[PDB]
Amino acid sequence: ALDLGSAEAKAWIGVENPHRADVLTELRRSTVARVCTGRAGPRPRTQALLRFLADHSRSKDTVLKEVPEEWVKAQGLLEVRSEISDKNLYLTRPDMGRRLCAEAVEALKAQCVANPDVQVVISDGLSTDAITVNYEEILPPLMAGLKQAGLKVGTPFFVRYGRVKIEDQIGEILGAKVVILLVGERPGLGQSESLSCYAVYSPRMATTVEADRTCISNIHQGGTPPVEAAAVIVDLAKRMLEQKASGINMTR
Amino acid sequence: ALDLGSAEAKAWIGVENPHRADVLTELRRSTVARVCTGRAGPRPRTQALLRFLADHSRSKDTVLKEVPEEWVKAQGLLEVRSEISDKNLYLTRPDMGRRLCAEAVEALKAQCVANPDVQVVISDGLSTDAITVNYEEILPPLMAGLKQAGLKVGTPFFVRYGRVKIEDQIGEILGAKVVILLVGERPGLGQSESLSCYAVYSPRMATTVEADRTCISNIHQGGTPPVEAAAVIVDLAKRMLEQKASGINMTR
Amino acid sequence: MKLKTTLFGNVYQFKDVKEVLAKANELRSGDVLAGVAAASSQERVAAKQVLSEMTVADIRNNPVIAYEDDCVTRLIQDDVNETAYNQIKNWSISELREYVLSDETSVDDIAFTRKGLTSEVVAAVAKICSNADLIYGAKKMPVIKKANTTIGIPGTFSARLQPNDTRDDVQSIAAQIYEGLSFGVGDAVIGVNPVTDDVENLSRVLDTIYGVIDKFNIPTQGCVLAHVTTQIEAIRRGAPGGLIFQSICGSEKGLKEFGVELAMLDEARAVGAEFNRIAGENCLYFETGQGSALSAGANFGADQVTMEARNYGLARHYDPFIVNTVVGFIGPEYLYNDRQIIRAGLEDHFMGKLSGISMGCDCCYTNHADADQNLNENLMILLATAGCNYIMGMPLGDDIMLNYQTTAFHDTATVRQLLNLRPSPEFERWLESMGIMANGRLTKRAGDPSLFF
Amino acid sequence: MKLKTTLFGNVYQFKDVKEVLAKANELRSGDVLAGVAAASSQERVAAKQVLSEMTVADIRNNPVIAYEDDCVTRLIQDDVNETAYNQIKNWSISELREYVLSDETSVDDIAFTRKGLTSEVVAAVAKICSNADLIYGAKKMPVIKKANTTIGIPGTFSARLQPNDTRDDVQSIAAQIYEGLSFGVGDAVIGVNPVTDDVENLSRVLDTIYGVIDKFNIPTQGCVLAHVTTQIEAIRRGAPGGLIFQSICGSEKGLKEFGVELAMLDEARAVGAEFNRIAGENCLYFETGQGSALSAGANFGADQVTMEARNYGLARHYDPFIVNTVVGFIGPEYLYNDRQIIRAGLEDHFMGKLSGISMGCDCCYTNHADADQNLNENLMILLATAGCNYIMGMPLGDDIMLNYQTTAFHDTATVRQLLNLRPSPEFERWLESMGIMANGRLTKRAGDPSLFF
Ligand code: B12
Ligand code: B12
Ligand code: NA
């Protein structure tokens, strides 16, 4: 009796007549990559294939999982929306994902503060689980350390169906000097909760290239932990404002 | 310049250093199979691939196209339906194409003659062109053939979205001794006019098998001519009622 | 046995072996149509896991139609080597998969092991194989047969010449034959589907085929792919016998749809031994394909892959020269698109080779399926790497008459020269004599049917 | 030129070469998204026709972004052999397709002919090729390069070891390396995408890779796939140099988006010659893929296949050791499903080989695309028959960090033993010394990373 989602199945070693089986256990302990499952001829072993297939069925489900907006409302967040209406239309039109709809400009101008030094934007992106697992652990201690010894922190909000180039339009509307965007990257096989931060100094839709952004990726419990990743963004926000330089233009 | 649909494009000989190009011309003339197109290496020549691709674009159109209800009414036919609503469902549900709908049973009992010796049914099937091109050429000499010299003829009607096994339900409801179905078989690459006749003696829904049918296939202008196919179906119906024998159950 | 597993905290329960077999299949339109497919990807994987834990005994002792009700089930069960079976009966299907794929398992090992299998066990192994598992597994299971050519030697690749015509016009049939031979197609067979099931017509078609064979002394076979009943009559009354053909189905009810008794196939074997112009010991030819039992109402709640495996269990009994699936012959109702047609082709070939028959494939599609000629070319090459015994050949793959698209003459030459494969050694000798082939390659004057004139 | 044809009585008129190039593509998601795709199947074939009648001069003199505005265009145009061009400029694209596919065209014939091409002409040939055309066409154009291994010899097949980690944990990287080597993966390169783009981290990852290389005297290369600027720094300040990597795009706007100047690529070549531990003459490594130019706003109304060819024109200038497309790396926006991803991979590889670069392919997909692992295994085998120079290897193909699925270590060993292909000759000798390979085949002891302990 074996669950393919269980911790016993994850740690399963399938190499048949090992040279050194104690080394195999430490190798499997070293990584979350699917090592040490052995082979049948040159093919995967059956259990490794089955666990692969199990994990892929879960991984498909995570891409079109969506946040409840009553989760978003009870985070204390403004929910705002891009041009896209569907999850199906998000997956197939990146261009509508990186500009806001007609009421989204209006809600942000009327309800959010104008000309902040640092502006925080949250999007579901390609993984809902990335922002929904990590939120309580990222957002308060980030939005501490910006206001807690800095200056004018902008009011945070949630973009639905966002691509990262939408933060160019957001930076222009609010007049924002640094725009930072926490967003769900594409789901992997084994894990859905990986968060990225994309960050421009003073973005402009007709000017800022992708290389002008600073990326910090792989934010979760199995990457850089969301507590201490909030510290490294606050530090980056300081370094950005000081040298007026965005991403590839940052020193050293 | 060349139209890929033209007779000149169809006649094209692509073999580049022929042994005997007079034989090549006699061989291209003797078949409508795509011979004598030559090669680039072991691959097809470009014009041969282009005319293949053009014929496929148009063959793809011929499957999904439907004869107007106006055309069927203009033939003087009863139109009747299977259980399928539309062309999309027809392609994926053969089980519902083998059953008359609820109003279909009643319309047939209302408006068709009871206990025919021969019953002629028409369906679009998988090619509308197969019945649209051939109809006026096959149906008059068939209808004359059977009654005029012969026996009791049931009233002809058209089934939308028919599969071949629906004639077992038709033969039971009408009490028919012989059911003749003329139906569009699936379209070929360069050809969509191909009609087949499926005929069964005295069918019974939970008894008759496919081998109990006689097939006469490839009725069109490039096959058996629709005029002289009508005579061979009448003769088949004469023999059928004589030896009271179905398909493989027939002699010689 | 367990009919039950837990996956991601959720219990997945199944009714019987038949349901486990059905839902473990990769998604296809026919399994959804039959009502037997999995509800989700998670239940598909759960069915795969339940299947993999079941023994060879579990699935041997639960055929999808019962022993007493079905003559094909009886055929398959009676043919089992019981001491081969007793060695493997307590193997899990997971263990049988890994055994097949193992580089330490030889051809001679599998030769004895496969005799302890039934078709349902063959199907079970295919259901838990990936696409590369099917291809590699089939490759290390060669099946070699002989008529006037030898087929299925590793490093070789054969092709049916399929010269079909709308009128059975004998000039049109001949023109396609000369075209096919100029590309090196026809070492499997020269095989016509005729318009008329009629002794005088069959003899004329066969006289035309063997006219070309006798003129140029071609090591090959003729076939006319009418009903086996009319073939036998034609040959008895003195038409040239090469291969004798029948379309088959994996149930008794399915055979009744086709008008086929088992005793007709016994008769075809007996007629072939009396009459047929065959040097070697194999002279029968079957065709198969997924969906045929569903179409017949003869699948009895079983999926089309398990039913198609039972074809190969039926075929094996008669030790035919060649069998092929006709993979996308029917349409989108049973296999919808490229992905499903490729997957079926690799399944069918693997199961054929595991059942120990001389398995080829008509890599094909229809014009109402979501598919084009690029799919034929994907599939033919994948199957060629799997050591597929043969494909079809027609002029650019256009059947003017069966209304579908198979592989070109071009495509056999392409596969051979891509992958360094030869024809049947007898037929290759003939191609070299005619100046059509040198060192496996089409010469300059190849691809030209004027050469024969 | 004719920008016009009539198909089935209907006049199809196109505005320019760029529209003809775009609409002649096989249907894909990204071409529809760019707005540049054909409206119907009939118009696609019409565009294919018009393209085929267009001459080599017609397409060479119409690059999709103009000479004066784009440095990639200039680079591609300046690299043309004008004597080679003048020989072929009046060839139709139809005649160039047939020339490439012809068995009478040798590898040395194409060696000169390809120097008269631009990338747009390379793209034009691929657009009127079927899937088997792309595979057979690519196969008869081998491209051979050498670092510490030789890649691209017919009968060989290489693999990037891609030992990626979420933290750049050097234990997790090493574990994946020992695993890949035990399957015979890593003759192309051992190549890590890092998490952090800084010098001491790059130096530590490189020390980890070369720790294994130096201990076991492996003939191979290390690489860290950060930005080319940070690699150069790392190597200048004393980190072991193997291959130097950059992602490229087919326009100046697209390069600007990636933060690359052309002069960095010249510096990488100069740093390589000064510093890098490479016995042969090739030491650069590019990655490409369809949709990157679209994503950047940098396609200028060109289709993704044409833009991807312009990558290979850019790469060719720098004579790299290896280039691969990353075929379904981005998602369903640009290539939607199995059919589209296979077609892209076959196009990309054919166009790479025709451009005369050492072309491999990351056979891969994402989880928000309509694809699975059977897609990877279909594509990897098709490309292997096309003589694809290399694929990726990861444990079961699960990247824990780039969030996608590539090919397994298993898959390279499968492909090699399926198709009787060897590793790079230098690396194969090392595998035989380790007792991992005999006669192109994994030994009993292979597949076991504790062998190194
Ligand atoms: C898909 C992808 C790309 C795509 C582009 C994104 C797309 N069109 O969807 C392609 C193939 C072009 C690509 C290219 C490169 N990428 Co990239 N990419 C990824 C990946 C796998 C997904 C990111 C994601 O899902 N974003 C969320 C979605 C919802 O946003 P999106 O709007 O759909 O995509 C935007 C961003 O992804 C952005 N982007 C993509 N890559 C990079 C890299 C940097 C430095 C920046 C600032 C932005 C950026 O471009 C898109 C805007 O149109 C991540 C891996 C990961 N763990 O996430 C790496 C990743 C972000 N990329 C990486 C790198 C280094 C590159 C390259 C610079 C490679 C190189 N060394 O030359 C190039 C150039 C990128 C550029 N400067 O424009 C690194 C970034 C390292 C860092 N912290 O600075 C990552 C983290 C992977 C790694 N190696 O660790 N990549
Ligand atoms: C597709 C096809 C099949 C499919 C059936 C499709 C399905 N199950 O859904 C399969 C592969 C199962 C098949 C099998 C056979 N077929 Co068939 N089939 C064809 C084909 C190409 C298309 C017919 C069509 O489009 N029907 C119209 C559609 C709209 O109706 P449908 O409800 O969707 O399909 C029904 C019919 O196709 C019917 N059917 C199919 N083949 C045959 C053969 C005969 C003799 C009969 C009575 C009925 C029949 O079965 C379906 C009902 O469930 C034709 C060739 C052509 N150009 O027409 C040959 C063709 C009709 N078949 C032929 C033959 C001989 C056979 C076999 C007897 C082969 C053999 N020699 O053993 C078997 C057994 C048939 C049976 N008794 O069940 C011959 C008929 C010769 C004749 N005039 O008697 C044809 C003309 C091809 C040829 N060789 O010339 N076939
Ligand atoms: Na020429």
Side-chain angles (χ1 to χ4, degrees):
Chain A
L2 175 83
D3 201 318
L4 293 154
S6 73
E8 201 195 310
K10 280 178 170 73
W12 177 74
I13 290 145
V15 189
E16 246 154 309
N17 282 297
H19 198 238
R20 276 191 68 169
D22 47 322
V23 176
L24 282 190
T25 308
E26 189 52 53
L27 260 28
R28 188 76 209 88
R29 207 181 112 99
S30 281
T31 188
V32 71
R34 292 166 197 264
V35 297
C36 295
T37 66
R39 55 189 186 90
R43 301 305 308 144
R45 288 205 71 172
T46 308
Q47 186 172 321
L49 174 62
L50 286 179
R51 194 184 138 247
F52 191 102
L53 256 29
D55 280 2
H56 187 49
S57 71
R58 200 146 132 269
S59 182
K60 284 291 250 288
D61 278 350
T62 55
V63 333
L64 77 141
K65 209 194 266 150
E66 294 199 61
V67 228
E69 64 277 322
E70 47 252 306
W71 186 88
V72 181
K73 204 190 167 187
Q75 294 326 289
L77 278 189
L78 211 147
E79 174 157 307
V80 91
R81 217 255 312 236
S82 82
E83 206 153 290
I84 270 135
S85 45
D86 291 332
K87 243 291 161 196
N88 313 86
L89 244 105
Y90 176 78
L91 253 34
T92 198
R93 314 282 255 94
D95 53 345
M96 291 166 141
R98 58 202 24 178
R99 64 192 152 172
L100 299 148
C101 72
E103 290 162 293
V105 193
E106 252 56 73
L108 224 71
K109 251 134 96 201
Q111 295 180 239
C112 286
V113 297
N115 307 275
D117 299 0
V118 274
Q119 180 65 53
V120 193
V121 191
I122 296 130
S123 196
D124 60 304
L126 282 167
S127 202
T128 287
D129 289 348
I131 54 135
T132 220
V133 167
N134 288 295
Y135 182 79
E136 188 77 272
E137 225 181 294
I138 279 264
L139 209 271
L142 170 78
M143 284 278 303
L146 293 167
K147 156 73 70 245
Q148 183 127 51
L151 221 60
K152 202 183 170 168
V153 60
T155 150
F157 60 93
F158 173 76
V159 173
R160 205 171 210 93
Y161 305 120
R163 308 287 179 160
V164 323
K165 271 180 151 89
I166 211 168
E167 86 183 330
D168 303 344
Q169 195 179 41
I170 290 159
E172 275 201 56
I173 283 154
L174 292 174
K177 264 81 84 92
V178 170
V179 190
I180 62 153
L181 169 103
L182 316 149
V183 70
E185 59 209 55
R186 47 202 233 181
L189 229 201
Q191 156 264 289
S192 50
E193 48 189 67
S194 195
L195 190 132
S196 268
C197 162
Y198 298 90
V200 229
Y201 178 80
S202 198
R204 210 90 54 212
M205 298 177 272
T207 299
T208 172
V209 297
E210 206 57 42
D212 281 324
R213 288 167 184 90
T214 319
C215 181
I216 158 128
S217 65
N218 302 102
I219 302 159
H220 48 108
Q221 217 73 266
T224 173
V227 176
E228 72 150 51
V232 90
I233 297 161
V234 164
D235 182 81
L236 187 76
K238 286 181 205 218
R239 303 209 323 272
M240 222 168 271
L241 283 156
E242 271 144 40
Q243 66 186 287
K244 288 201 162 192
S246 291
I248 218 258
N249 331 287
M250 310 241 331
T251 49
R252 197 140 64 197
Chain B
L2 187 70
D3 206 301
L4 293 164
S6 73
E8 198 197 311
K10 288 191 176 86
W12 175 70
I13 297 142
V15 181
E16 223 183 295
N17 272 295
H19 189 247
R20 275 171 68 93
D22 48 325
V23 173
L24 232 30
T25 248
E26 275 279 326
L27 253 55
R28 199 39 184 123
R29 220 210 164 277
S30 86
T31 186
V32 305
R34 285 165 200 261
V35 296
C36 302
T37 46
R39 50 192 190 85
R43 301 306 305 143
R45 290 204 69 173
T46 313
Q47 196 188 307
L49 171 68
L50 281 157
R51 192 179 80 79
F52 188 103
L53 255 40
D55 286 357
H56 194 49
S57 76
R58 183 221 19 100
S59 173
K60 263 293 200 159
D61 281 340
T62 57
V63 18
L64 34 89
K65 74 171 273 143
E66 308 200 48
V67 75
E69 300 85 47
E70 321 269 49
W71 179 90
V72 181
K73 199 171 153 271
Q75 293 324 293
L77 286 170
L78 230 204
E79 199 190 311
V80 84
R81 209 182 271 222
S82 79
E83 270 183 26
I84 265 118
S85 53
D86 57 79
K87 250 281 167 208
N88 284 142
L89 242 98
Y90 177 81
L91 293 177
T92 57
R93 304 287 309 271
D95 57 337
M96 294 178 102
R98 296 162 180 191
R99 271 133 68 213
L100 295 159
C101 80
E103 292 171 69
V105 185
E106 297 307 301
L108 257 52
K109 267 135 78 197
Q111 291 174 79
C112 304
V113 333
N115 304 285
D117 291 13
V118 287
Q119 181 57 54
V120 177
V121 190
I122 304 118
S123 186
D124 57 323
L126 277 165
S127 198
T128 281
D129 288 9
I131 50 134
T132 287
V133 174
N134 293 309
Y135 181 85
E136 189 74 279
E137 216 181 280
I138 191 143
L139 225 291
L142 174 67
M143 272 330 171
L146 291 156
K147 168 71 119 278
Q148 167 200 81
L151 25 85
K152 187 179 180 175
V153 162
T155 167
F157 65 98
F158 168 80
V159 180
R160 209 164 210 90
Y161 307 126
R163 306 273 188 166
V164 170
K165 276 188 167 72
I166 212 173
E167 84 178 341
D168 299 335
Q169 200 188 348
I170 286 153
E172 252 180 53
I173 285 149
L174 255 32
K177 262 82 85 74
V178 165
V179 185
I180 293 144
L181 175 74
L182 318 169
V183 65
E185 64 206 58
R186 25 78 132 347
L189 186 68
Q191 201 269 156
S192 294
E193 291 178 17
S194 204
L195 176 87
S196 39
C197 165
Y198 294 89
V200 62
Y201 173 72
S202 196
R204 213 71 55 209
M205 282 197 279
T207 292
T208 167
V209 297
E210 210 59 37
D212 296 331
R213 315 191 201 279
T214 307
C215 181
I216 302 156
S217 64
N218 309 98
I219 302 147
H220 51 102
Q221 205 84 290
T224 310
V227 201
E228 67 179 71
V232 88
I233 292 158
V234 170
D235 173 84
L236 177 73
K238 284 200 239 216
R239 277 187 289 114
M240 226 133 106
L241 278 141
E242 266 159 53
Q243 51 187 277
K244 291 164 188 143
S246 309
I248 58 148
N249 304 314
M250 297 193 87
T251 62
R252 282 144 200 174
Chain C
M1 61 183 156
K2 296 235 263 139
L3 274 320
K4 186 168 86 167
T5 198
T6 300
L7 177 64
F8 301 122
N10 298 331
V11 180
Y12 290 85
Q13 183 86 69
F14 303 99
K15 224 120 134 126
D16 37 45
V17 180
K18 186 147 78 196
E19 200 201 333
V20 182
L21 287 165
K23 297 190 160 163
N25 277 346
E26 290 315 295
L27 203 261
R28 61 210 75 216
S29 63
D31 283 348
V32 179
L33 171 71
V36 299
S40 87
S41 269
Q42 278 93 4
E43 199 199 19
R44 164 129 60 252
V45 177
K48 276 185 205 281
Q49 204 205 2
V50 170
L51 185 56
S52 72
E53 309 274 82
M54 300 211 277
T55 63
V56 170
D58 282 332
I59 287 137
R60 199 253 163 120
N61 293 317
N62 293 283
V64 288
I65 322 127
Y67 183 89
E68 25 164 47
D69 294 328
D70 191 80
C71 72
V72 179
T73 301
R74 290 198 289 277
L75 207 261
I76 290 158
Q77 293 294 327
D78 292 347
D79 270 3
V80 174
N81 190 292
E82 290 302 329
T83 94
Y85 169 72
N86 281 345
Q87 284 178 4
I88 60 162
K89 67 173 181 220
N90 293 316
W91 292 13
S92 74
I93 304 304
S94 164
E95 278 161 346
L96 185 48
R97 178 199 115 101
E98 299 184 327
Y99 176 82
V100 167
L101 296 173
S102 171
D103 290 324
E104 311 307 311
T105 309
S106 69
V107 176
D108 285 336
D109 291 332
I110 283 156
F112 188 64
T113 299
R114 74 152 56 84
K115 289 179 198 195
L117 302 180
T118 53
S119 299
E120 280 92 0
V121 189
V122 171
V125 178
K127 278 151 201 288
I128 59 161
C129 285
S130 81
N131 278 19
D133 301 332
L134 297 169
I135 289 160
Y136 192 84
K139 179 60 181 175
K140 65 206 297 303
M141 297 191 278
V143 180
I144 297 164
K145 302 290 154 198
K146 209 222 162 75
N148 300 322
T149 54
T150 315
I151 196 159
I153 302 164
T156 71
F157 187 79
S158 292
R160 169 168 168 209
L161 192 29
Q162 188 175 292
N164 290 347
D165 181 74
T166 48
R167 286 110 38 216
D168 300 326
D169 182 283
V170 296
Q171 336 266 218
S172 162
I173 286 157
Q176 285 170 84
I177 287 166
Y178 292 130
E179 179 95 319
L181 301 168
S182 83
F183 279 91
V185 172
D187 43 341
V189 70
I190 308 164
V192 180
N193 314 78
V195 183
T196 336
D197 240 278
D198 150 60
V199 174
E200 167 184 326
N201 182 65
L202 296 199
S203 302
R204 194 194 307 120
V205 172
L206 284 170
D207 277 344
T208 306
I209 292 166
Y210 274 89
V212 179
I213 295 176
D214 291 340
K215 183 160 185 217
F216 295 101
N217 255 84
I218 323 175
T220 185
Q221 295 75 233
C223 194
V224 80
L225 278 81
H227 203 267
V228 66
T229 281
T230 53
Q231 282 175 85
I232 281 156
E233 222 205 324
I235 290 157
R236 288 194 118 112
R237 308 219 308 127
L243 303 190
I244 307 184
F245 168 78
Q246 188 41 59
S247 292
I248 47 159
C249 202
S251 62
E252 178 161 359
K253 205 209 159 145
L255 290 176
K256 282 207 213 271
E257 273 272 279
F258 285 10
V260 182
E261 300 157 29
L262 248 35
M264 290 169 190
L265 308 177
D266 297 325
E267 202 194 329
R269 195 175 35 178
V271 161
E274 190 159 297
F275 283 108
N276 281 30
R277 295 180 29 173
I278 300 286
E281 232 35 59
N282 309 98
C283 75
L284 292 183
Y285 177 17
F286 304 124
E287 276 189 324
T288 63
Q290 285 181 35
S292 70
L294 219 171
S295 172
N299 64 296
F300 295 89
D303 67 276
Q304 56 197 49
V305 174
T306 308
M307 290 315 294
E308 173 77 351
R310 288 171 54 94
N311 267 327
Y312 308 148
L314 170 57
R316 173 67 188 92
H317 179 79
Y318 295 100
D319 198 28
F321 177 58
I322 45 166
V323 186
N324 66 269
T325 181
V326 208
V327 59
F329 185 58
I330 304 168
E333 344 142 19
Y334 307 123
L335 300 156
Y336 177 70
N337 52 16
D338 298 23
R339 170 183 314 159
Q340 283 168 39
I341 286 155
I342 286 158
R343 170 75 195 177
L346 305 173
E347 282 165 346
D348 291 347
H349 175 239
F350 168 82
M351 287 187 306
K353 279 334 211 317
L354 183 53
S355 312
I357 67 178
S358 183
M359 191 67 193
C361 178
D362 192 343
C363 316
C364 71
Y365 63 96
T366 54
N367 292 306
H368 61 317
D370 186 35
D372 55 25
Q373 196 62 27
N374 286 323
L375 149 76
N376 277 2
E377 292 170 3
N378 291 351
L379 179 56
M380 76 181 200
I381 287 165
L382 288 164
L383 281 172
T385 69
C388 189
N389 275 14
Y390 69 110
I391 56 175
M392 314 292 115
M394 284 192 307
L396 300 171
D398 188 7
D399 212 312
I400 54 170
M401 173 255 185
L402 288 179
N403 295 356
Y404 84 122
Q405 283 91 257
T406 190
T407 47
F409 301 138
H410 296 86
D411 286 332
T412 288
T414 301
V415 156
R416 282 173 179 167
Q417 289 171 207
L418 186 75
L419 291 183
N420 198 2
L421 309 173
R422 303 310 178 91
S424 295
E426 303 90 357
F427 193 78
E428 175 180 38
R429 227 175 290 124
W430 179 79
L431 290 173
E432 289 171 337
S433 267
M434 295 294 294
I436 299 169
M437 191 171 271
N439 308 115
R441 320 203 84 214
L442 293 192
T443 66
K444 228 169 194 199
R445 56 218 170 284
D448 174 38
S450 285
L451 185 128
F452 295 93
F453 286 85
Chain D
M1 59 190 144
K2 302 280 116 213
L3 296 158
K4 186 176 88 162
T5 197
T6 165
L7 220 211
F8 299 123
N10 298 323
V11 176
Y12 291 93
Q13 167 76 46
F14 303 96
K15 211 144 113 129
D16 38 44
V17 175
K18 187 190 267 155
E19 163 157 48
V20 177
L21 285 168
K23 290 194 162 164
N25 278 342
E26 293 308 300
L27 199 264
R28 68 211 64 218
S29 184
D31 285 345
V32 182
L33 171 74
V36 301
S40 67
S41 264
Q42 275 90 7
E43 198 200 17
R44 177 166 291 106
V45 181
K48 274 190 216 276
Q49 239 250 84
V50 170
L51 188 54
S52 77
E53 315 267 44
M54 295 223 274
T55 212
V56 165
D58 282 335
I59 282 115
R60 197 251 161 121
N61 294 321
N62 296 271
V64 290
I65 319 127
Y67 186 89
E68 313 103 82
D69 299 327
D70 192 90
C71 68
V72 181
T73 302
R74 289 200 287 280
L75 183 134
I76 291 159
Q77 294 291 328
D78 293 353
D79 276 350
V80 176
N81 194 292
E82 294 300 335
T83 303
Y85 170 71
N86 280 165
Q87 283 181 352
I88 60 164
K89 64 163 177 268
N90 293 320
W91 293 14
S92 78
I93 300 313
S94 164
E95 287 168 336
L96 186 50
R97 196 206 76 122
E98 291 180 338
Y99 173 82
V100 167
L101 293 171
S102 173
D103 290 325
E104 304 310 306
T105 309
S106 67
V107 69
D108 282 338
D109 288 329
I110 288 151
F112 189 65
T113 303
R114 129 208 309 139
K115 294 178 185 181
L117 302 180
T118 55
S119 300
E120 278 92 357
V121 192
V122 176
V125 177
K127 280 152 200 286
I128 57 162
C129 279
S130 83
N131 277 26
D133 296 338
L134 298 165
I135 290 160
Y136 192 85
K139 178 62 186 167
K140 66 207 294 301
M141 308 186 278
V143 180
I144 298 162
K145 302 290 150 188
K146 201 211 198 292
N148 302 316
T149 54
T150 312
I151 195 157
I153 300 171
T156 76
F157 183 83
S158 287
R160 169 169 168 209
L161 221 159
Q162 188 175 289
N164 285 345
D165 178 76
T166 347
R167 280 111 52 242
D168 298 323
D169 183 11
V170 302
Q171 313 270 249
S172 159
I173 291 154
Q176 287 176 80
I177 288 168
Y178 293 126
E179 174 92 314
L181 295 173
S182 78
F183 282 91
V185 171
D187 42 338
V189 64
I190 307 166
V192 179
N193 313 80
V195 171
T196 33
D197 206 286
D198 74 85
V199 167
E200 61 232 50
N201 183 67
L202 296 210
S203 301
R204 169 162 26 83
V205 176
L206 279 173
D207 280 345
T208 310
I209 294 156
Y210 273 86
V212 181
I213 293 174
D214 292 337
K215 172 151 192 231
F216 295 100
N217 294 303
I218 324 174
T220 186
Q221 295 74 231
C223 190
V224 168
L225 279 83
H227 205 275
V228 63
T229 325
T230 329
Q231 286 175 79
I232 282 157
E233 262 194 310
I235 295 161
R236 276 199 203 274
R237 318 224 280 116
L243 300 189
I244 301 174
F245 167 80
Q246 193 37 58
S247 288
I248 47 165
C249 201
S251 68
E252 187 165 359
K253 223 275 244 294
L255 293 179
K256 222 101 159 162
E257 178 101 328
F258 283 17
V260 272
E261 300 163 8
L262 249 35
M264 300 168 181
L265 262 35
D266 293 317
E267 199 197 340
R269 191 158 34 85
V271 160
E274 194 154 285
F275 281 110
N276 281 28
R277 293 175 37 169
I278 302 293
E281 285 318 290
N282 310 98
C283 82
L284 290 194
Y285 172 18
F286 304 121
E287 277 191 322
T288 63
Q290 278 179 42
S292 66
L294 217 169
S295 173
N299 61 301
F300 292 85
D303 68 278
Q304 58 194 56
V305 170
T306 308
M307 288 311 297
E308 175 72 358
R310 290 171 54 90
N311 267 324
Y312 309 147
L314 179 59
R316 181 56 192 97
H317 182 83
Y318 293 100
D319 201 19
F321 177 55
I322 43 164
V323 186
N324 68 271
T325 181
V326 207
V327 58
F329 190 61
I330 306 170
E333 333 134 43
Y334 308 118
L335 302 154
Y336 180 72
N337 53 16
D338 290 19
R339 154 164 17 194
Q340 281 170 42
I341 292 159
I342 286 159
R343 172 69 195 191
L346 299 182
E347 279 163 348
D348 293 344
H349 172 62
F350 170 82
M351 287 189 309
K353 285 301 168 75
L354 182 54
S355 307
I357 66 176
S358 179
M359 187 72 192
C361 173
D362 192 339
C363 311
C364 73
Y365 64 98
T366 59
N367 290 302
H368 62 311
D370 193 11
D372 56 26
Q373 199 60 26
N374 289 325
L375 176 271
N376 277 0
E377 291 173 5
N378 286 347
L379 181 52
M380 104 211 166
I381 289 166
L382 287 169
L383 280 171
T385 71
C388 186
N389 276 13
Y390 68 109
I391 54 175
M392 312 299 118
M394 295 194 77
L396 303 179
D398 182 10
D399 206 315
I400 60 191
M401 167 253 192
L402 281 175
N403 290 353
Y404 82 123
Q405 286 93 266
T406 183
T407 47
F409 300 138
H410 295 87
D411 290 327
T412 290
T414 301
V415 151
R416 282 174 175 163
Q417 290 170 199
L418 188 75
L419 297 176
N420 311 306
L421 311 166
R422 299 309 174 97
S424 299
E426 305 92 348
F427 191 81
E428 171 182 31
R429 280 198 297 275
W430 178 80
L431 291 171
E432 294 174 333
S433 268
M434 294 301 291
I436 296 169
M437 192 167 275
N439 299 114
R441 225 194 83 167
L442 292 188
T443 60
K444 268 196 203 232
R445 282 173 277 100
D448 174 35
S450 40
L451 202 261
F452 294 93
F453 289 88

